[PDB]
Design an enzyme around this catalytic site. Structure first.
Site, PDB file in Angstrom:
ATOM      1  CB  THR A 253      -0.984   0.089   1.296  1.00 53.80           C
ATOM      2  OG1 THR A 253      -1.948  -1.042   1.104  1.00 53.80           O
ATOM      3  CG2 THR A 253      -1.560   1.379   1.483  1.00 53.80           C
TER       4      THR A 253
ATOM      5  CB  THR B 224      -0.351  -3.461   6.253  1.00 54.69           C
ATOM      6  OG1 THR B 224      -1.642  -3.262   5.706  1.00 54.69           O
ATOM      7  CG2 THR B 224       0.370  -2.232   6.345  1.00 54.69           C
ATOM      8  CG  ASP B 225      -3.183  -7.043   3.531  1.00 57.72           C
ATOM      9  OD1 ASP B 225      -4.025  -7.258   2.200  1.00 57.72           O
ATOM     10  OD2 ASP B 225      -3.923  -6.178   4.315  1.00 57.72           O
TER      11      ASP B 225
ATOM     12  CE  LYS C  16      -3.945  -5.528   8.210  1.00 62.36           C
ATOM     13  NZ  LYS C  16      -3.177  -4.167   7.841  1.00 62.36           N
TER      14      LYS C  16
ATOM     15  CE1 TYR D 187     -10.197 -23.671  31.123  1.00 62.50           C
ATOM     16  CE2 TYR D 187     -12.083 -24.570  32.043  1.00 62.50           C
ATOM     17  CZ  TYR D 187     -11.369 -23.358  31.751  1.00 62.50           C
ATOM     18  OH  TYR D 187     -11.787 -22.158  32.117  1.00 62.50           O
TER      19      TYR D 187
END
Lengths: 324, 324
Positions: free
Chosen positions: B11, B81-82, B152, B271
């Site tokens: 981007t 950024t992805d 992210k 658990y």
């Protein structure tokens, strides 16, 4: 003020059995251990260990609430935290325009451990149910959130639930439950549509991922698929056959694109990959929570299997789950 | 001060085009177009769109960095950024004991836009790379985070990245990068372990999920499976064959169990359902980020297929990714 409390199991009903925590307490015993005793009728629907809730349990729960919704002023449901958002969301789609407040709650620590959050959460749910704000919600760590907007973002800390992309409905301030805003998208008629298709698959998009698994999911008989993509959304069409495979599967079954991110959601219009993905036939999830998305698709698939109808219903704000 | 700046695209290098955003701008143009032209040097390895990065690219970037680690004092990598957390995580495992500061940055808006965060993010990366603090980090919105710990969480706002279950390395206070703590888990000798197996799949656990998709992943050739669990940890065995299928597949291919929640991570000892999963063969991902968990498994699978060895390494704090 007549209140009904149904038990589903979960950590709030757990206790250490040398083999770690395991569901063991009934609802009536949970209330006493919490020191709570308004007319409260306690009932156990089941007592399932956390993580073991199945779609079938939503049906049983929905039918139970449906026949009691006109006999009580409020209903509280003690549930495991792991799948609480799933149940809340599915109930929201199955029981539309509920006449009374229905609130799900649970805890991160069993009532037996010190500093347990169980009493506090039970107290908050009961406090909210007396306020008369109809709808289905989740009460946790001093907040009341619209069920279809709640997501579990923490697996250990007390503030495990958060209202994503939507504001809290109620909060505790100065030791009292203050209403921040009343959700207003409910109609007049209360109808129950306890019908759904549980077999959908949720795959996370990772670099290098192939479409072979998607093709295999169709063959295995999955009626729908949800891809957890990156940022604003988009399917990779480089170095892999993921895109070409999706372009084909998306015409037989619905392929929904959601985000790996927790906040802001999807917008397939933003980038080129998004637009290409939109062309392949992927259905956008908007700003819906993962849980609302998954349960909505299941619910929709229980009424129709036409891609076009699924696409429209998916982009429709049915019970406040999405912002248009 | 001799800094190298590599461009991966993203981007930060996109232009509104016509069919939505798509990278196009070069590393040289990006710098100048950010009020910044210290002896620097820009070089483009590629200009990949919004989500097209793939494992192969991590190797190219890794070797391209290895034969430059000594000729510079710091490296900055402009990236989309992805999948920035994925690249940052993989580099951390491949380039152990980096002698200089390697920082990855990007932006939610292209520099070719008003009020872009690109300049600020770039200035923070360059500012930080001049503090001599070695390692692999991600700078973004005024924070510098250990790369193998960054995730992210937001898909639209400027505060997109966050250090998960670990504190930030640097933050901006009173308009100045302040060091909060220096990661020390680093050794002295520098070496590269550039190897990986890319074919692993991640599927989110949802109520009612069948084991059929896990059995087919094995037949399809997947060498590792990562199950994104509910919370603390556990594999459903009620009304589903999932636990049954995982019990056997986990002995042929490593199946890792991590959590869907962003915070706190996993703990299979809490658990009973968790202890049962741990005994059935599943491998805990501790408190690692999803990105570090995925890239680490690929990396490990690059030199072995022995279940016990991968379980042992997945549990080892290799380069700051986990809290033992």
């Amino acid at each position: 003020m007549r209140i009904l409390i149904l038990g589903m199991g979960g950590t709030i009903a757990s206790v250490k059995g040398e083999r770690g925590y395991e569901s063991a307490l009934s609802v009536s015993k949970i209330l006493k251990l919490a020191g709570i005793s308004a007319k409260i009728e306690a009932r156990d629907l089941m007592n399932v260990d956390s993580t073991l809730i199945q779609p079938s349990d939503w049906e049983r729960l929905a039918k139970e609430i449906e026949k009691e919704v006109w006999e009580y002023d409020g209903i509280v449901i003690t549930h495991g935290t792991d799948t609480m958002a799933y149940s809340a969301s599915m109930l929201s789609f199955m029981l539309r325009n509920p006449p009374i407040p229905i609130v799900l709650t649970g805890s991160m620590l069993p009532i037996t451990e010190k500093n347990s959050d169980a009493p506090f959460n039970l107290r908050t749910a009961l406090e909210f149910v007396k306020l008369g704000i109809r709808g289905i919600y989740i009460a946790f760590n001093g907040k009341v959130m619209l069920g279809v907007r709640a997501s579990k973002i923490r697996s250990m800390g007390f503030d495990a639930f958060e209202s994503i992309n939507y504001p809290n409905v109620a909060e505790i301030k100065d030791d009292k439950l203050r209403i921040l805003h009343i959700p207003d998208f409910y109609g007049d008629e209360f109808f129950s549509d306890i019908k759904y298709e549980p077999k959908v698959l949720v795959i996370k998009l990772i670099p290098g991922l192939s479409g072979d698994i998607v093709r295999e999911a169709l063959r295995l008989g999955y009626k729908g698929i949800i891809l957890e993509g990156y940022g604003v959304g988009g399917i990779p069409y480089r170095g892999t056959d993921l895109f070409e495979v999706v372009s084909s599967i998306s015409k037989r079954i619905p392929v929904v694109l959601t985000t790996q991110a927790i906040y802001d959601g999807v917008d397939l219009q933003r980038y080129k990959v998004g637009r290409i993905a939109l062309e392949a036939g992927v259905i956008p999830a908007g700003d819906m929570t993962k849980e609302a998305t998954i349960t909505k698709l299941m619910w929709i698939l229980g009424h129709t299997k036409n891609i076009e109808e699924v696409k429209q219903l998916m982009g429709k704000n049915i019970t406040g789950e999405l912002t248009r």
